[PDB]
Amino acid sequence: GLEALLRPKSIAVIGASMKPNRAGYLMMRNLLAGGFNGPVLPVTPAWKAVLGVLAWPDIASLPFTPDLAVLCTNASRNLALLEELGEKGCKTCIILSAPASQHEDLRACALRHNMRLLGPNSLGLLAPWQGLNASFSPVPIKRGKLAFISQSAAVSNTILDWAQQRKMGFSYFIALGDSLDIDVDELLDYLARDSKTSAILLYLEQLSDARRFVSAARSASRNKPILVIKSGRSPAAQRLLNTTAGMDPAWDAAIQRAGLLRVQDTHELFSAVETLSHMRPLRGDRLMIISNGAAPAALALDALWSRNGKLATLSEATCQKLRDALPEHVAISNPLDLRDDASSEHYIKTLDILLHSQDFDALMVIHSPSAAAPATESAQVLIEAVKHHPRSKYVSLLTNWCGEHSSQEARRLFSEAGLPTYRTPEGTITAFMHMVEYRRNQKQLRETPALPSNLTSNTAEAHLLLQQAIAEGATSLDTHEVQPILQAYGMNTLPTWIASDSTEAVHIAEQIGYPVALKLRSPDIPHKSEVQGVMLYLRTANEVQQAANAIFDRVKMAWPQARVHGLLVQSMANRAGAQELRVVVEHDPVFGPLIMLGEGGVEWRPEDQAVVALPPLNMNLARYLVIQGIKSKKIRARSALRPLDVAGLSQLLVQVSNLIVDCPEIQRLDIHPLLASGSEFTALDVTLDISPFEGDNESRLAVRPYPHQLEEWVELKNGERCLFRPILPEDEPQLQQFISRVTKEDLYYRYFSEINEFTHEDLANMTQIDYDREMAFVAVRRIDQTEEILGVTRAISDPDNIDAEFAVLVRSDLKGLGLGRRLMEKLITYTRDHGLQRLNGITMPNNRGMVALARKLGFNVDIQLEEGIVGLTLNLA
Amino acid sequence: GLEALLRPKSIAVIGASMKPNRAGYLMMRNLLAGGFNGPVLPVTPAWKAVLGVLAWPDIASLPFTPDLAVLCTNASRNLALLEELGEKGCKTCIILSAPASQHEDLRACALRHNMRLLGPNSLGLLAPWQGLNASFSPVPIKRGKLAFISQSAAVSNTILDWAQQRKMGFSYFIALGDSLDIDVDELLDYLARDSKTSAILLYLEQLSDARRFVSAARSASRNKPILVIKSGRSPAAQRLLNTTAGMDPAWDAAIQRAGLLRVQDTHELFSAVETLSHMRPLRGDRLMIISNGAAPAALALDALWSRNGKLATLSEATCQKLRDALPEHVAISNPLDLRDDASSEHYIKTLDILLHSQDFDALMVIHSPSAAAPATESAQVLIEAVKHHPRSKYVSLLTNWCGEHSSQEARRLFSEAGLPTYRTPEGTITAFMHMVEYRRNQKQLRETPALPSNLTSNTAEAHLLLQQAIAEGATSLDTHEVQPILQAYGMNTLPTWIASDSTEAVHIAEQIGYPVALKLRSPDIPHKSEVQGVMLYLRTANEVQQAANAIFDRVKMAWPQARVHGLLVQSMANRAGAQELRVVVEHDPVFGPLIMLGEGGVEWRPEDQAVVALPPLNMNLARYLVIQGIKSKKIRARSALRPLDVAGLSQLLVQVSNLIVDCPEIQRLDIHPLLASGSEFTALDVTLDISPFEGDNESRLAVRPYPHQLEEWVELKNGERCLFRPILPEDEPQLQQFISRVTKEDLYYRYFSEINEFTHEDLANMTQIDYDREMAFVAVRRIDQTEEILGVTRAISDPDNIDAEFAVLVRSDLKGLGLGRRLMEKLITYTRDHGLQRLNGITMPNNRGMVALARKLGFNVDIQLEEGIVGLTLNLA
């Protein structure tokens, strides 16, 4: 648990000192200036009191056991001091520095004593809502709603400096170190469930395992917005930070899959700080601009034109009302009101009329200082106008006072009122487009797979084709051998022939019809481009003879004993009007299998043109990949006389995904060229690199599919039919009504040694699930083409796979029918099969039905006095 | 002249008022708070004094004639008031507003009275070095070295607001309007010759003629750096500013040709303000970074990696000296020194050692606030350290204090010391790369723009081929007819055949050899893609028959009477290995003829993929175009199995340039596809659209070449041989030595009613010439692989082509040989042929040789007393 870290009751500072040049000095001073509500205990034999607080000589002399310990002493003593703490019985410790070794001994000690470590080389922790400042930083912070996580101590200090100088308030501020024991995935759950947090910010430099990162981020992304920034993109940056290099395009794919957003530099980062706070969520994507000058708005438009933004169109009634406010303003005929010497009176006369309509979703006000309209007065007038209007709740506001010297007070007043403000134009447009893109991506996230009948045994035949190949010892196959495997999955391939020498080669080429393409087959060297036998636009046989003989003599000269089993030759179709593509499937070691698409030619450089994605795929994901690739001009749409059809390409990609996920023996696949001719798609040359063995065939992925084999039909006690099945994201509406007609007593659960009761956010969170560590079943009824929920059950498992917590909810007017018992039996089966030890829960004593059911099971029920909670324990053996 | 505007002796304010809401009030208040050294005369009958100064009722009652007048009254009175001024005899007037009409009457009045106007709707003029503030703005300014020119009053006010709130000092600040009488080209000369100006900044929104703009910018760019920003890029911005759309890449081409630099937005604009001042010019491109944190430097590196920047390598001696300054600093082994908790002492001990080496060309220091090193004291220490070092002269310095709240005082101190400072990392790298790119481009500007190869008159035969075609009335041509014209200029083309129907078409297709490509010829509809009858790569005669019959039927059903003179058919080469390009030559109305290069296919849209240039071209310019196109990835280098050779493509482009410049009857040329195969380049299909008539074939262009037909060999009075020829940029070194051994009296000339004497910058300026409005001849002698200059002569003409000023310089020890007389005769011939009226000059009375020569000519000499200047006048005819 993380409650002894994010909510301690007592703290012991080991290494507290009266020397101002020490970290213990700064830690004590920061801790005593925060507003903490517990004791701070300095431990040192070199003083009798530190900053006015009585000190203790050693850990064993402490009057009681603390919750949190901070080690400000040197690294040499680390391993000893930890041991002492283990004897005392403390729960968590923060370590200042380590010499890059003894990580093994540190982890062993922590596991032995059941202790949690905040990574060494960590700047610390700040919790303003508890008045906690267990940190080494020199700048203060304020209460707020924004949580931040950082990785490097240099990064942590740089970012907190930039932040405090940006002044923005915070909810949490955690600086990880080597992430030896506590990692990002664990923190994400706590932060998502927190109530003071409204957005989350990350700064990542490296990761240990991306599967759990993606899973937890996916789970937590439906509550609040989440943003990222990464910096390992150039070789010098890679070497200075000591990180691996060749996985950058996969990071974009993972970020897209988790539903998060990426920012480029730190200049857009303080815009991100300004927009995550002070800005309310949007309801659309229509923008209205007003200003007292032509150029600024113009500079904005270009920016909005480079990100494909949407403008607003004014109604004729609003246009008429705006007229008569002042003449010589043609700007009534465009979504950018324009003035040159306007006063604040015109500003208010425009604001009041504009706010009354239903024409846009966000308003952008630009001011260039002028004699007619001073900055401070305009700011005050705008603030009051926004205050007194009743429609201001349904509109987003953006401001831009463009005078640095003369607009400091106006900006301070805006910040006090809680209004966003930006230094320059197209810094507002960047934030607006950021938010629009976030809303769209969150619109398209909801997706999970479904498999109607899995696959038949015919693919097993295909499987045998590989088995014998690995029995034969072969590790790579060619098109001629690979044809049946592709055919089994619905792929189309062209036929090819093999000739032992030139004579038969031409003897068959004359039959199939010139032109004709040639190639070799030599297992030793995969670089057939070294030979480059491709031939086109010719029909004479002598050229074929000379080319074949030259290739034969060359391969003999390089190595006469090199094995050659023939020469591959194929016919040509009407490729002049055809389009060339290229497809690759690789095995990245951070994310697992990966699918990349691009164009043909030796120009292939994956970091440049490859558009990349993660399996598995369905039609929608493939369509989105194709659209993204085309729009970014990575792939041309009309390279030929005809357009490109996207349905066929998406279907081909789905087939590829099915094939690679089903068969794990494949390690690499390359289709080059891929011939796209209108509605038809065909493969010209295909290469497979395969390896034997596989452990589980599922852990190798990052996202796991929907378990349709648990879906059940059950006839109730009274002969009624219903369906028991796992939960889906689409059940959120149904879940909100079902919670109304449920008794209050059963709505309690235990979270972090506290008792709370379910709310709507809890159910919405419950809909977004990974079916590995958390499970939920629903019982559903079908009436008149609607689904109505009767009962829910949930189970959550711990990281070490030794405990779990369960909860059950049933609707009113449904009691006594055994529904709860059936759900509990279904949960017991699944949990015992998963491999857990025991199951824990709680309920009220006044509620007799649940305790009666638990007794019927015969599993332990304990009763807590003075609190009124009954604990249920079910040992699965 | 512009001296009565930029240096007035007296000003009259027409419309001065005591009402604080009028522009006359603000003009009077601004004028009286500047430090002007002349009278300010208010003219009004509605008051007896304005702000304590006696007023006059009307223009006729003014005691004397003013130099400058500002019209602050209404527009209705404009035409009357100007007339009165014309009677009084004033020289220049600034107009505040006009109703978009009566521009013609204003022009007529000004030309009638010989008066100059600063465009209506202009914010005014600021000259701090004269204490002049003839403006309507509310923001003060300071003395400096940066000149700014702006176009729109909204733009002008926005920019000056952004500037004063940026606070930077200025040399001049001119706000044009409709540019009715005074334009950018005229101001560029004055600003180039000015001494208080160090750099020039522009904000352009539209231009009248790009010819003179490019010419003057080219002339003035060799003195100081010049930067631009343009904003007409999106259709909404175009409509809000009322400008035409389709010329953006042409603007890039022209800006490159003139030697200027372009910036994107205003966020890089105050970086430009900070870098144009406070930063000394570089001597190289090697950069060194030091910081107290890892992430900031990393964020910089990526940016420097995205612009192909250069880092520095440390010498072993410097590395050794740096070691022992503080242990545990791995950063000794990279060009980014890195610290975590460093102090000021480490900063100084690093700076002193680093400045002593010769390893880099610029140093970038980053600071993240921390307890060990407070911002203010670190800034003070850095400033003093830079002060006391002797090597600080030869190094450029960049600073970046990254704490906004806590680094205000340090930034102010840096600004006081005259050091550049930037808010964020990679805002510094942007400026550094800006300056590096500017230096490189200015390195590559100098050229030898000529037509030395010329051409024989036998290509007149080619001309006849066009003439008869237009005599016959034809307006377009096909490949079959165009073959000989392309052949005459050294271009290669493939043969093609014409068939009357399907039968003979296939009958010859079988002979030429499959595959075969078809096309039609219909004068009415040029969209043969609309017919879409072209078939490629198929090898069956009956398919050709069907395709031709379908084309026949389709063209008949569209229009049965449509002309058909046959069907074009050609035989494919080994095209599969070949690479495809596309070339087009158009006639833009702003810049003239234009040449664009790109890739084939219906995807062709010039705004995106076309790389564009201005004729004429030589090998170097074509090579640079090709390199830029490849690097920006608009064109690929290895779409095929082989690379792309650049020499052949550049030669092809040079041939195209020669062809289009020679023959003006061609209005459009299109070569698509262009087949590139190794060193061979061939044309597949070519289309020419031609029109008759042409004025002079030279004014139609934007840059005019070197006039090699004036190069002469001359034998002197004593019989010595020398060469008289026009000047080139390469003569700058030789020009300096020649100026040492020249008498002192003759070194004077008359500029703006002042006598000055030539310096080295004047000669460097004279080397950059346009051979239209200014000419210069040199007399040169060859000695064992060197050129030594004996004498120079120059002539400068006025805009209206009615006056000109001349100057002659002869070296010591070479008098009495007639060299001066020969140069003068050569100048007289050229000037009379140009079409001028008279020639003006001056010299000293004590110098008797020059006046003796002028008398020998017999042309007027007048003598001025109390001045010692003798004026020479020579009336050509």
Show the 3-state SS of B108-162: HHHHHHCCEEECCCCCEEEEHHHCEEEECCCCCCCEEEEEEEECCHHHHHHHHHH
- H-helix or E-strand containing B547? helix B541-558
Number of Cβ within a 10 Å radius of residue B545: 15
Q: Find the helix packing angle between A541-558 and A502-512, rounded to 10°.
A: 140
B781 — contact with chain A (CB < 8 Å)? no
Pairing of strands B754-757, A68-71: unpaired
Q: Which residue, B281, B276, B527, is CA-closest to B396? A: B281
Inter-chain residue contact B301 with A237, CB threshold 8 Å: yes
Cα–Cα distance, A584 to A871 (Å, whole number)? 55
- Partner B, chain A 269-308, Cβ-Cβ below 8 Å: 293-299, 301-303, 305-306
- Taking CB atoms and an 8 Å cut-off, how many pairs form between chains A and B? 215
Cβ proximity of A409 and A374 under 8 Å: no
Q: How many CA atoms lie within 13 A of A51 on its CB side?
A: 20
Q: How far is A199 from chain B (nearest CA, A)?
A: 23
Question: Residue B845: what are its φ and ψ, rounded to 5°?
Answer: -75, -35
Could you list the beta-strand ranges (E) of A88-229: 92-95, 116-118, 124-127, 132-135, 143-150, 170-175, 199-202, 226-228
The amino acid occupying position A839 is: L
Cα–Cα distance, B209 to A706 (Å, whole number)? 68
For B311, the 3-state DSSP assignment is strand
The amino acid occupying position A434 is: H
Cα–Cα distance, A779 to A714 (Å, whole number)? 9
Question: Residue A675: what are its φ and ψ, rounded to 5°?
Answer: -95, 115
- Partner B, chain A 147-186, Cβ-Cβ below 8 Å: 152-155, 157-159, 161-162, 164-167
Q: Which residue, A149, A147, A150, A79, is CA-closest to A117? A: A79
Q: How far is B311 from chain A (nearest CA, A)?
A: 10
For A434, the 3-state DSSP assignment is helix
Tokens of A490: 């619905």
Inter-chain residue contact A299 with B266, CB threshold 8 Å: yes
Q: Find the helix packing angle between B460-471 and B479-488, rounded to 10°.
A: 150
Cβ proximity of B826 and B777 under 8 Å: yes
Q: How far is A775 from chain B (nearest CA, A)?
A: 40
Interface test with A, best of B159, B161, B370 (most A CBs within 10 A): B161
Inter-chain residue contact B405 with A167, CB threshold 8 Å: yes
Residues 6+ apart with CB under 8 A from A47: A16, A17, A18, A55
Interface test with B, best of A21, A165, A243 (most B CBs within 10 A): A165
Cα–Cα distance, A829 to B807 (Å, whole number)? 106
Tokens of A96: 């200042």
Inter-chain residue contact B240 with A139, CB threshold 8 Å: no
Interface test with A, best of B165, B405, B532 (most A CBs within 10 A): B165
- Partner B, chain A 591-620, Cβ-Cβ below 8 Å: 601-603
Q: Find the helix packing angle between A267-276 and A428-444, rounded to 10°.
A: 70
Q: Which residue, B482, B669, B499, B502, is CA-closest to B570? A: B499
Cβ proximity of B521 and B567 under 8 Å: yes
For A37, the 3-state DSSP assignment is coil
Tokens of B1: 């002249």
Q: How far is A162 from chain B (nearest CA, A)?
A: 6
For B389, the 3-state DSSP assignment is coil
Contacts of A405 in chain B (CB under 8 A): 164-167
Q: How many CA atoms lie within 13 A of B449 on its CB side?
A: 18
**For residue A609, what is the nearest residue in chain B, using CA coordinates?**
B633
A450 — contact with chain B (CB < 8 Å)? no
Cα–Cα distance, A134 to B305 (Å, whole number)? 38
Residue among B154, B303, B368 whose CB faces A340 most closely: B154
Q: How far is B226 from chain A (nearest CA, A)?
A: 21
For B717, the 3-state DSSP assignment is coil
Q: Which residue, A159, A147, A156, A153, is CA-closest to A190? A: A147
Cα–Cα distance, A736 to A766 (Å, whole number)? 12
Contacts of B570 in chain A (CB under 8 A): none
In angstroms, how far apart are the furthest CA atoms of chain B? 102
Helix ranges restricted to H, B168-225: 184-193, 210-220
Interface test with A, best of B158, B530, B539, B639 (most A CBs within 10 A): B158
Cα–Cα distance, A528 to A672 (Å, whole number)? 13
Inter-chain residue contact B167 with A405, CB threshold 8 Å: yes
Cα–Cα distance, B622 to B631 (Å, whole number)? 14
In Å, what is the CA distance from A815 to each residue of A53, A812, B295? 61, 7, 61
Which residue in the block uniquely carries the two structure tokens 């993660």?
Answer: A614
Cα–Cα distance, A795 to A840 (Å, whole number)? 10
Kindly report the CA angle at B381 between B380 and B386, in degrees rounded to 5?
100
Q: How far is A415 from chain B (nearest CA, A)?
A: 15
**For residue B603, what is the nearest residue in chain A, using CA coordinates?**
A638
Q: How far is A339 from chain B (nearest CA, A)?
A: 9
Tokens of A184: 């990002």
Q: Which residue, B604, B505, B598, B599, is CA-closest to B545? A: B505
What is residue B654's DSSP assignment?
Answer: H
Interface test with B, best of A21, A142, A240 (most B CBs within 10 A): A240
Number of Cβ within a 10 Å radius of residue A576: 18
Cα–Cα distance, A161 to B370 (Å, whole number)? 8
Number of Cβ within a 10 Å radius of residue B430: 19
Inter-chain residue contact A311 with B26, CB threshold 8 Å: no
Number of Cβ within a 10 Å radius of residue B58: 11
B627 — contact with chain A (CB < 8 Å)? no
Cβ proximity of A339 and A346 under 8 Å: yes
Residues 6+ apart with CB under 8 A from B671: B582, B583, B584, B683, B685, B686
- Partner B, chain A 570-589, Cβ-Cβ below 8 Å: 574-577
A311 — contact with chain B (CB < 8 Å)? yes
What is residue A128's DSSP assignment?
Answer: G
Pairing of strands B53-54, A124-127: unpaired
Burial (CB < 10 A; 0-12, 13-18, 19+), residue A243, is: middle
Cα–Cα distance, A544 to A528 (Å, whole number)? 17
A369 — contact with chain B (CB < 8 Å)? yes
**For residue B234, what is the nearest residue in chain A, using CA coordinates?**
A302
Inter-chain residue contact A240 with B294, CB threshold 8 Å: yes
For B24, the 3-state DSSP assignment is helix
What is residue B281's DSSP assignment?
Answer: P
**For residue B164, what is the nearest residue in chain A, using CA coordinates?**
A405
B415 — contact with chain A (CB < 8 Å)? no
Kindly report the CA angle at A581 between A579 and A585, in degrees rounded to 5?
160
Residue A335 preceded by cis peptide, ω within 30: no
Cα–Cα distance, B266 to A48 (Å, whole number)? 60
Cα–Cα distance, B167 to B160 (Å, whole number)? 9
Using CA of residue A599, residue A600, residue A603, residue A605, what is the dihedral sign?
positive
Residue B616 preceded by cis peptide, ω within 30: yes
Interface test with B, best of A301, A333, A422 (most B CBs within 10 A): A301
A682 — contact with chain B (CB < 8 Å)? no
Q: How many CA atoms lie within 13 A of B234 on its CB side?
A: 15
Pairing of strands B116-118, B92-95: parallel
How far separated are the first and last CA of chain B, in Å rounded? 25
Cα–Cα distance, A491 to A652 (Å, whole number)? 7
**For residue B574, what is the nearest residue in chain A, using CA coordinates?**
A537
Q: How far is B299 from chain A (nearest CA, A)?
A: 7
* Residue numbers followed by a gap, chain A, C–N over 2.5 Å: none
Inter-chain residue contact A294 with B340, CB threshold 8 Å: no
Q: Which residue, B430, B400, B436, B433, is CA-closest to B271? A: B430
Q: Which residue, A499, A689, A699, A671, is CA-closest to A592? A: A699
Q: How far is B448 from chain A (nearest CA, A)?
A: 37
- Partner B, chain A 522-551, Cβ-Cβ below 8 Å: 529, 532, 534, 536-539
Which residue in the block uniquely carries the two structure tokens 């699930």?
Answer: A769
Cβ proximity of A600 and A671 under 8 Å: no
Cβ proximity of A80 and A107 under 8 Å: no
Q: How many CA atoms lie within 13 A of A521 on its CB side?
A: 20
Distance from the Cα of residue B401 to its chain's centroid: 35
Contacts of A152 in chain B (CB under 8 A): 294-295
Residue among A158, A302, A305 whose CB faces B368 most closely: A158
Residues 6+ apart with CB under 8 A from A673: A580, A581, A582, A600, A684, A685
Inter-chain residue contact B266 with A334, CB threshold 8 Å: no
Residue among A297, A299, A574 whose CB faces B537 most closely: A574
Burial (CB < 10 A; 0-12, 13-18, 19+), residue A189, is: middle
Contacts of A155 in chain B (CB under 8 A): 293-295
Q: Which residue, A313, A308, A264, is CA-closest to A286? A: A313
Q: Which residue, B349, B398, B409, B339, is CA-closest to B374? A: B409
Residue A673 preceded by cis peptide, ω within 30: yes
Cα–Cα distance, A544 to A557 (Å, whole number)? 20
Inter-chain residue contact A539 with B514, CB threshold 8 Å: yes
Distance from the Cα of residue A820 to its chain's centroid: 35
Q: How far is A124 from chain B (nearest CA, A)?
A: 15
Cα–Cα distance, B109 to B103 (Å, whole number)? 10
B869 — contact with chain A (CB < 8 Å)? no
Cα–Cα distance, A601 to A673 (Å, whole number)? 8
